[PDB]
Enzyme design. Structure first.
Site, PDB file in Angstrom:
ATOM      1  N   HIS B 654       0.873  -1.174   0.000  1.00 18.79           N
ATOM      2  CA  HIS B 654       0.000   0.000   0.000  1.00 18.79           C
ATOM      3  C   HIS B 654       0.909   1.222   0.000  1.00 18.79           C
ATOM      4  O   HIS B 654       1.689   1.405   0.954  1.00 18.79           O
ATOM      5  CB  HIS B 654      -0.927   0.016   1.216  1.00 18.79           C
ATOM      6  CG  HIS B 654      -1.927  -1.098   1.235  1.00 18.79           C
ATOM      7  ND1 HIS B 654      -3.030  -1.121   0.411  1.00 18.79           N
ATOM      8  CD2 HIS B 654      -2.001  -2.218   1.993  1.00 18.79           C
ATOM      9  CE1 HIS B 654      -3.734  -2.212   0.649  1.00 18.79           C
ATOM     10  NE2 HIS B 654      -3.132  -2.895   1.605  1.00 18.79           N
ATOM     11  N   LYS B 663     -12.683  -1.950   4.162  1.00 18.34           N
ATOM     12  CA  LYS B 663     -13.415  -3.206   4.017  1.00 18.34           C
ATOM     13  C   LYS B 663     -14.736  -3.186   4.779  1.00 18.34           C
ATOM     14  O   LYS B 663     -15.792  -3.517   4.226  1.00 18.34           O
ATOM     15  CB  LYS B 663     -12.543  -4.362   4.506  1.00 18.34           C
ATOM     16  CG  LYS B 663     -11.293  -4.619   3.685  1.00 18.34           C
ATOM     17  CD  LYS B 663     -10.511  -5.777   4.288  1.00 18.34           C
ATOM     18  CE  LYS B 663      -9.220  -6.050   3.537  1.00 18.34           C
ATOM     19  NZ  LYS B 663      -8.446  -7.167   4.153  1.00 18.34           N
ATOM     20  N   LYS B 680       2.708  -6.232   2.207  1.00 24.59           N
ATOM     21  CA  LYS B 680       1.945  -7.466   2.362  1.00 24.59           C
ATOM     22  C   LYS B 680       2.886  -8.545   2.881  1.00 24.59           C
ATOM     23  O   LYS B 680       3.730  -9.045   2.126  1.00 24.59           O
ATOM     24  CB  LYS B 680       1.311  -7.895   1.042  1.00 24.59           C
ATOM     25  CG  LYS B 680       0.514  -9.180   1.139  1.00 24.59           C
ATOM     26  CD  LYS B 680      -0.111  -9.553  -0.191  1.00 24.59           C
ATOM     27  CE  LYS B 680      -0.949 -10.811  -0.062  1.00 24.59           C
ATOM     28  NZ  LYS B 680      -0.101 -12.001   0.216  1.00 24.59           N
ATOM     29  N   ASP B 727     -25.771 -21.732  21.935  1.00 23.36           N
ATOM     30  CA  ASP B 727     -26.459 -22.732  21.133  1.00 23.36           C
ATOM     31  C   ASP B 727     -26.257 -22.429  19.657  1.00 23.36           C
ATOM     32  O   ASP B 727     -26.334 -21.272  19.234  1.00 23.36           O
ATOM     33  CB  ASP B 727     -27.957 -22.763  21.479  1.00 23.36           C
ATOM     34  CG  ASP B 727     -28.669 -23.996  20.943  1.00 23.36           C
ATOM     35  OD1 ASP B 727     -28.025 -24.850  20.296  1.00 23.36           O
ATOM     36  OD2 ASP B 727     -29.891 -24.114  21.178  1.00 23.36           O
ATOM     37  N   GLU B 820     -24.173 -25.716  25.167  1.00 24.56           N
ATOM     38  CA  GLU B 820     -24.625 -26.878  24.403  1.00 24.56           C
ATOM     39  C   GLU B 820     -23.581 -27.995  24.457  1.00 24.56           C
ATOM     40  O   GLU B 820     -22.377 -27.728  24.540  1.00 24.56           O
ATOM     41  CB  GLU B 820     -24.904 -26.453  22.957  1.00 24.56           C
ATOM     42  CG  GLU B 820     -25.685 -27.414  22.059  1.00 24.56           C
ATOM     43  CD  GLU B 820     -24.816 -28.417  21.329  1.00 24.56           C
ATOM     44  OE1 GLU B 820     -23.622 -28.129  21.108  1.00 24.56           O
ATOM     45  OE2 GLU B 820     -25.352 -29.466  20.918  1.00 24.56           O
ATOM     46  N   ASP B1068     -33.821 -20.057  19.003  1.00 29.38           N
ATOM     47  CA  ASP B1068     -32.503 -20.249  19.599  1.00 29.38           C
ATOM     48  C   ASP B1068     -32.509 -19.860  21.072  1.00 29.38           C
ATOM     49  O   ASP B1068     -31.939 -20.570  21.914  1.00 29.38           O
ATOM     50  CB  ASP B1068     -31.467 -19.438  18.826  1.00 29.38           C
ATOM     51  CG  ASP B1068     -31.287 -19.940  17.410  1.00 29.38           C
ATOM     52  OD1 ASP B1068     -31.504 -21.148  17.181  1.00 29.38           O
ATOM     53  OD2 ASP B1068     -30.936 -19.130  16.527  1.00 29.38           O
TER      54      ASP B1068
END
Ligand SMILES: [Mg+2]
Ligand SMILES: [Mg+2]
Lengths: 117, 1115
Positions: B654, B663, B680, B727, B820, B1068
């Site tokens: 950049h 983004k 990068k 859950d 769960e 849910d």
RNA sequence: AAUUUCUACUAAGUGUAGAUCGGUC
């Protein structure tokens, strides 16, 4: 020096073609980097001279995934166009935007990028 | 007071810090001018040579040990194994004699023939140099003087190999169990029917060509099992039955090809012998090599595709075989073939239940959930459903072999449809000039190919039985097992390709340095003080590792304070410091006598304004003043040097002063601009040092006691805990319920988005839309392997963020955690979160909650790095997630999503349309079908004694209605159907009276069938509680047909957009809130039980008392 | 898309938000 200069003339025609593609890649890079990643078009990608005024909708290599991350090539500094997310590594340097999603897309969508915004 | 005063610092935990070490000064120049690079590369490649040549030398050791071993009790195990056993505790004497064989061969392993000069320095420095001819390798061995850390790790592997564990890696399990049970099986085949086979080719011609040894008929006695255990006995024994080239151009076949060659009736229903395995000790680096593997294995005319044609011919032979004795392995795929052949899954279970109703079920049915669980574990207990049993399970006009054959030709015909598009890929000159990682369609071809072949592999491995069973078929199972093993070889090809294609474009190669000392800082400045040649120097926010060269370290101890500047405090008192000077060690470094490698990371930067990481706060409180002994050092600090992967050609930046896009759509800004370069992956193009500093926390504990007992005592006197339902959801992928001890909803919210907090700025980031676009990528990429790995690792970062949110809930609320559970036997396959990712979630709960540290708290008090919370025991296995682990209260969950959160009614009326007899019995079971014109609704007063599997209700008699409207999903089509318009549509249609009360007998007067089928349809819509859309996310509501005692029906659209939701918002919150009420029941069991009775309180909840608590405790 | 490594960012300007013990298939 007859046919050699002839294929040099063909190389100069391909030079004007690839510089039209690079110019439209630069201005198209500016209108794409003007967009906040949501109004981006679904863009056909290629690593070949793709010539948007002479586009052929024949092969099944036509793809319509939303483009992004159009950064440099910092030995030669380019606009580079990842066709998916950040972590798909599908950098290219030839793009043509088209209308919408996959399957027998519409034809060209030339210079309507300001109508996307 | 609070509950966190006793659960701190109870036990020990070791950690491994990682930080950044960079060269300072001329240290790289001195490493270049002391030649430390060629001996580590050459020594490493020679180390791989040592691992190969000790695989070969240990292979020769296995050749030496297992050669001259005889047996004594061989004939008793054979004979008593084949006398058709008489189990009056007989098989424990047979198996105990087999244990005596395991201690006989283990006595031969442990007792004699060396066993002491095998895992030390003498096997590698004395016995290995006199071995390994072509003596250049001997010169490659003598460069490993004292560096036996990777050698003792390889010795840890090679002592995990040979033990009394008897796994597939153990040789005694393989030879005794595999070779002895297949040897006795080959004697059971050989004694029964071999007189039909041959009496002339075996002893005359085959003995003359092959061996001229003892007779092949004499190879079925005690003398041959003492000989086949060598490698030459495997080569001869597989050279007789399999065939061998015999060092000529003969290429002779074996006995089973002579069974095929015998030609008795052109079917050859004769038994075939089993092949016996070899010893346990017998490209993913380029595109063209793995592509060449695809040009070796899955081409048109391989032995693999020929074995697939032997599978198709094998099911033709199945069409001309019997249907008895062929067993089917019981699992989830018997439901899959139930869906293939019959209507639904548990129908075959129901037919099994029919036979079970022939045995246990009598008049006045006493069916309970204990009867359903003993019936379920009885269904697990059988495991041996044959094909004649499924033929008895088949009703009229249900051909098992014909529908089975047509749908398996449908499956392999779909595989042929994949092969039809795969023919033109690699015909003549397939050298693909592009990259394999670049092209898209070929990866789709090989992906769909390996998914069809691998799914067929799961199907055919679901066509196994139990093994070592009674009378079983004799020619199907030979090519079944052999072609199964070839298909497992292309499963390894799937492993190689799938491990190749998702290679990242940057490689990670780390290796520990030694600097020619096999004593490198194993302690922390102990009494040796010159063998470690390294100490920790400090300067402000920059640390400096001091590595001393041994040519100067013998007289380097000249430590002056010098009273000017540069106090590099060295570490001692194995923990304190000793001051030193600056320009002396600057003279040492600038002349080449000392090495100083900077310890540093992102968080020691001056250019920083935010909160640091967790390892950095571990490291700052390490050398702090008031460290009473909480965080201490440990041995084995490991400095890893890392090479470069990204070259200077493929760097992408950049640039400076260019407004780039952003983004996140939740960004309040839209562009951003810097004044320098943002690369990068700059951290992989360099060469970097990375240091591991293993620390230990709470090595001297304070209180060792049972955690869960103290949890049950402290919550027995407590009145208000909290419970956190986590859950997997259909639309909201993760959801958080936090409820009190009474039942009132305290805090429920979703985790579609994550709130990022930095510098007081709170910026959200949504993962529902982001991973929704990742499912768009999985929906359209013509490739999914990189896409599925992006979903898996994206969900790994996602569940790491969820680990942060749950740790903030424990540090903020201090709740007990029902979430769960994975081991309830439940499987829905409707949510977008799969099982393995949630296994990684609870795995990160185990590895995280061992010592939980807050980052923005006071280090003097509890919660910090010094006094973090120890609330979860260590990691043992995947099966250790059994109903309780610390504060992680694992709770199984049956019937929580599709149950009314207001009343508690669950789907008990099986409204599948069976016949008109059970429809007239269904309507005749209603005790009061009445209609009133004022309500304009249809009342149903009924009794749950007249219906099947409705004994779990407490009242048995209920008043029901029909409120609102429904969405009949398919006539999808979105067929929105109301309530009074459908019954009045059918009653104004067909013209029967409905303006009167007690019409339960008028409805049974009809003889047409569509009246009863449409009434069962309206019962199905009335009892369909999932009133969703499955299109747009407009109203995913949950309205119930049953009102409570208050008189109002539960409409979830009213209780969704509220500031204080007293009721759950969707399905849910319904499910996780009901798991929360299950722990409210379990704390009710804590109120019922005694003090020591808390050692054995049942926590695994049933459903009958869950309907009792669900109905009788709504208010 | 910059990190002690991993993931979602640019996030006040060579970073920011979390998580991580271990050499072994
Ligand atoms: Mg930071
Ligand atoms: Mg990243």
């Amino acid at each position: 020096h007859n046919d050699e200069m002839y294929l040099v003339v063909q190389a100069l025609i391909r030079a004007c073609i690839i510089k039209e593609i690079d110019l439209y890649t630069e201005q198209l890079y500016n209108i794409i980097k003007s967009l906040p990643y949501d109004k981006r078009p679904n863009v056909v990608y290629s690593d070949q001279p793709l010539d948007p005024n002479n586009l052929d909708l024949s092969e099944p290599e036509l793809w319509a995934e939303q483009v992004g991350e159009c950064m440099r090539y910092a030995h030669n500094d380019q606009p580079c166009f990842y066709i998916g997310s950040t972590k798909r590594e599908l950098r290219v340097n030839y793009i043509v935007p088209v209308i919408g999603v996959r399957d027998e897309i519409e034809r060209v969508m030339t210079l309507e990028e300001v109508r996307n915004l | 007071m609070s509950k966190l005063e006793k659960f701190t610092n109870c036990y020990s935990l070791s950690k491994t810090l990682r930080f950044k070490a960079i060269p300072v000064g001329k240290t790289q120049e001195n490493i270049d001018n002391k030649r430390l690079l060629v001996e580590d590369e050459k020594r490493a490649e020679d180390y791989k040579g040592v691992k190969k040549l000790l695989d070969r030398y240990y292979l020769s050791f296995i050749n030496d040990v297992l050669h001259s071993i005889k047996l004594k009790n061989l004939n008793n195990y054979i004979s008593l194994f084949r006398k058709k056993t008489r189990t009056e505790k007989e098989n424990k004497e047979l198996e105990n004699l087999e244990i005596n064989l395991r201690k006989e061969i283990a006595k031969a392993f442990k007792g004699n023939e060396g066993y002491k000069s095998l895992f030390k320095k003498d096997i590698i420095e004395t016995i290995l140099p006199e071995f390994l001819d072509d003596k250049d390798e001997i010169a490659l061995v003598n460069s490993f003087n004292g560096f036996t850390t990777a050698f003792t790790g390889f010795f840890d592997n090679r002592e995990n190999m040979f033990s009394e564990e008897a796994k597939s890696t153990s040789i005694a399990f393989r030879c005794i169990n595999e070779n002895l049970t297949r040897y006795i099986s080959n004697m059971d085949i050989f004694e029964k029917v071999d007189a039909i086979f041959d009496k002339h080719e075996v002893q005359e011609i085959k003995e003359k060509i092959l061996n001229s040894d003892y007779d092949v008929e004499d190879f079925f006695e005690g003398e041959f099992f003492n000989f086949v255990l060598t490698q030459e006995g495997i080569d001869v024994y597989n050279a007789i039955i399999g065939g061998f080239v015999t060092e000529s151009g003969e290429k002779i076949k074996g006995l089973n090809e002579y069974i095929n060659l015998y030609n008795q009736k052109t079917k050859q229903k004769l038994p075939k012998f089993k092949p016996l395995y070899k010893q346990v000790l017998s490209g993913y680096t380029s595109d063209e090599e793995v592509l060449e593997v695809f040009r070796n294995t899955l081409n048109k005319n391989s032995e693999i595709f020929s074995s697939i044609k032997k599978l198709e011919k094998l099911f033709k032979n199945f069409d001309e075989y019997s249907s008895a004795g062929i067993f089917v392995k019981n699992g989830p795929a018997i439901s899959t073939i139930s869906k293939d052949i019959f209507g639904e899954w548990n129908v075959i279970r129901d037919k099994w239940n029919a036979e079970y109703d022939d045995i246990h079920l009598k008049k006045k049915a006493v069916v309970t959930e204990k009867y359903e669980d003993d019936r379920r574990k009885s269904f697990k207990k059988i495991g041996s459903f044959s094909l004649e049993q499924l033929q008895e399970y088949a009703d009229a006009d249900l051909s098992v072999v014909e529908k089975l054959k047509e749908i398996i030709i449908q499956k392999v015909d779909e595989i042929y449809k994949v092969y039809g598009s795969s023919e033109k890929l690699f015909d003549a000159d397939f050298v693909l000039e592009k990259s394999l990682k670049k092209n898209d369609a070929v990866v789709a071809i090989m992906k769909d190919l390996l998914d069809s072949v691998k799914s067929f592999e799961n199907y055919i491995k679901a066509f196994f039985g139990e093994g070592k069973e009674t009378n079983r078929d004799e020619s199907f199972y030979g090519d079944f097992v052999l072609a199964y093993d070839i298909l497992l070889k292309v499963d390894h090809i799937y492993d190689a390709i799938r491990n190749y294609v998702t290679q990242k474009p940057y490689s990670k190669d780390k290796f520990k340095l030694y600097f020619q000392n096999p004593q490198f800082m194993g302690g922390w400045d102990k009494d040796k003080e010159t063998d470690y040649r390294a100490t920790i120097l400090r300067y402000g926010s920059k640390y400096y590792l001091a590595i001393m060269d041994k040519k100067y370290a013998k007289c380097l101890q000249k430590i002056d304070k010098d009273d000017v500047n540069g106090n590099y405090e060295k570490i001692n008192y194995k923990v304190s410091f000793e001051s030193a000077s600056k320009k002396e060690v600057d003279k040492l470094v600038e002349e080449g006598k000392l090495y100083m490698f900077q310890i540093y990371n992102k968080d020691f930067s001056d250019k920083s304004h935010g909160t640091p990481n967790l390892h950095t706060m571990y490291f700052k409180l390490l050398f702090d003043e008031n460290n009473h002994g909480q965080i201490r050092l440990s041995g084995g600090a490991e400095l890893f040097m890392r090479r470069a992967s990204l070259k200077k050609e493929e760097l992408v930046v950049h640039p400076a002063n260019s407004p780039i896009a952003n983004k996140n759509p939740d960004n309040p800004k839209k562009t951003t601009t810097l004044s320098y370069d943002v690369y990068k992956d700059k951290r992989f193009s360099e060469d970097q040092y990375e240091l591991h500093i293993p620390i230990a926390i709470n090595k001297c504990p304070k209180n060792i006691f049972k955690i869960n007992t103290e949890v049950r005592v402290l919550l027995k006197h407590d009145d208000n805990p909290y419970v956190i339902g986590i859950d997997r959801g259909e639309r909201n992928l993760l959801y958080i319920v936090v409820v009190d001890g009474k039942g009132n909803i305290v805090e429920q919210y979703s985790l579609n988005e994550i709130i990022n907090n930095f510098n007081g700025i709170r910026i959200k980031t949504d993962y529902h839309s982001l991973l929704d676009k990742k499912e768009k990528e999985r929906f359209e990429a013509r490739q999914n392997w990189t896409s599925i790995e992006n979903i898996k690792e994206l969900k790994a970062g996602y569940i790491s963020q969820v680990v942060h949110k749950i740790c903030e809930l424990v540090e903020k609320y201090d709740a007990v955690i029902a979430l769960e559970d994975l081991n309830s036997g439940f499987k829905n396959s409707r949510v977008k979160v799969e099982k393995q990712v949630y296994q990684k979630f609870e795995k990160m709960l185990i590895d995280k909650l061992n010592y939980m540290v807050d980052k923005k708290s006071n280090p003097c008090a509890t919660g910090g790095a010094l006094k973090g919370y120890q609330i979860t025991n260590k990691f043992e296995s995947f099966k250790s997630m059994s109903t309780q682990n610390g504060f992680i209260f694992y709770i199984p969950a049956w019937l929580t999503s599709k149950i009314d959160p207001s009343t508690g009614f669950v789907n008990l009326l099986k409204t599948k349309y069976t016949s008109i007899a059970d429809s007239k019995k269904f309507i005749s079971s209603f005790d009061r079908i009445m209609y009133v014109p004022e309500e304009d609704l249809f009342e149903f007063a009924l009794d749950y004694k007249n219906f099947s599997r409705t004994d779990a209700d407490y009242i048995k008699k209920w008043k029901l209605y029909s409120y609102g409207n429904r969405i009949r999903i398919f006539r999808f089509d979105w067929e929105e159907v109301c309530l009074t318009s459908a019954y009045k549509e059918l009653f104004n249609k067909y013209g029967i009276n409905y303006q009167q009360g007690d019409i339960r007998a008028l409805l049974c007067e009809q003889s047409d069938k569509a009246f009863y089928s449409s009434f069962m349809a309206l019962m199905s819509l009335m009892l369909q509680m999932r009133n969703s859309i499955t299109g747009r996310t407009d109203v995913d509501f949950l309205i119930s047909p049953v009102k409570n005692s208050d008189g109002i029906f539960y409409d979830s659209r009213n209780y969704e957009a509220q500031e204080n939701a007293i009721l759950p918002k969707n399905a849910d919150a319904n499910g996780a809130y009901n798991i929360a009420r299950k722990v409210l029941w379990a704390i009710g069991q804590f109120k019922k039980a005694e003090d020591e009775k808390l050692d054995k309180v049942k926590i695994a909840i049933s459903n009958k008392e869950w309907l009792e608590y669900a109905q009788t405790s709504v208010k």
